[PDB]
Amino acid sequence: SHDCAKVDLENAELRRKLIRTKRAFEDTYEKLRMANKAKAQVEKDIKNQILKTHNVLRNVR
Amino acid sequence: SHDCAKVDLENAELRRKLIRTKRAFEDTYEKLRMANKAKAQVEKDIKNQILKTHNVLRNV
Amino acid sequence: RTEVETADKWRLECIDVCSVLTNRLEELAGFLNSLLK
Amino acid sequence: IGQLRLELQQARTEVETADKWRLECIDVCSVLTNRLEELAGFLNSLLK
Ligand SMILES: [Cl-]
Ligand SMILES: [Zn+2]
């Protein structure tokens, strides 16, 4: 036996918290995905710039 | 006024899901905080390197 | 023969300059590489 | 006499070598400078 009104109240509060927390997780996960993507692009361009720099250094005396 | 056993099961399942989602959000938030911190450090060092480069170019 | 003097007036300077520029370029390649860690 | 001609030839050779050194160092300095300016702009682009 439980407190019927209390478990109804807790059911509703848990559902509210779960929506809020899922939304916070999806938003933060998307922010992290965007950050990782931007960093990967940066590292690709950095590699290109390193290679161009060494090419100049090799051609230069 | 409800199905007592059914709301008990649903409440237990909601609590399990909320723990799982809270943990995922906290872990992902921690990773994002770490990434932001690392990027902030990179941008500070980049600033110093730009300034040294412009100083060398200016003296030449 | 002053053409030699005037034409060599900035030789030592341009050598020092190229050394400093090369050093900055090498340091920049190392720094960029450090960003990939 | 012919010694003045020989020393004039030596002066011309020294001018040629000095001009070669100068133009080569200008070429090198130019390429290095351009790479450094490009790198400064790239680094700045990373701050956006
Ligand atoms: Cl470039
Ligand atoms: Zn009940």
Residue numbers in the entry:
A (entry chain B): 1081 to 1141
B (entry chain A): 1081 to 1140
C (entry chain C): 508 to 544
D (entry chain D): 497 to 544
Task: Please share text taken word for word from the publication where this structure appeared.
In flies, Centrosomin (Cnn) forms a phosphorylation-dependent scaffold that recruits proteins to the mitotic centrosome, but how Cnn assembles into a scaffold is unclear. We show that scaffold assembly requires conserved leucine zipper (LZ) and Cnn-motif 2 (CM2) domains that co-assemble into a 2:2 complex in vitro. Purified CM2 forms a stable 2:2 tetramer with the purified LZ of the PReM domain, and we solve the crystal structure of the LZ:CM2 complex, revealing that helical dimers of LZ and CM2 interact in an anti-parallel fashion. Thus, Cnn molecules have an intrinsic ability to form large, LZ:CM2-interaction-dependent assemblies that are critical for mitotic centrosome assembly.
Domain boundaries were designed using PSIPRED, and we recombinantly expressed and purified a 55aa “LZ” fragment (aa490–544) and a 67aa “CM2” fragment (aa1082–1148) from bacteria. Crystallization of the LZ:CM2 hetero-tetramer revealed that the LZ and CM2 were entirely α helical, with each domain forming a parallel homo-dimer that interacted in an anti-parallel fashion to form the 2:2 hetero-tetrameric complex. Although the N-terminal half of CM2 formed a canonical coiled coil, the C-terminal half adopted an unusual “splayed” conformation that wrapped around and clasped the coiled coil of the LZ. A splayed C terminus was also observed in crystals of CM2 alone, indicating it is a feature of the CM2 sequence rather than being driven by the interaction with the LZ. Assembly of the LZ:CM2 tetramer buried the canonical Leu residues that define the LZ (L528, L532, L535, L539, L542) (blue asterisks, Figure 2A; blue residues, Figure 4A), and also three residues that appear to be invariant within CM2 domains across species (Ile1126, Thr1133, and Leu1137) (orange asterisks; Figure 4A, orange residues,). Two Cys residues conserved within Drosophila species in the LZ region (C521, C525) line the interior of the coiled coil, with C521 consistently forming a homotypic disulfide bond.
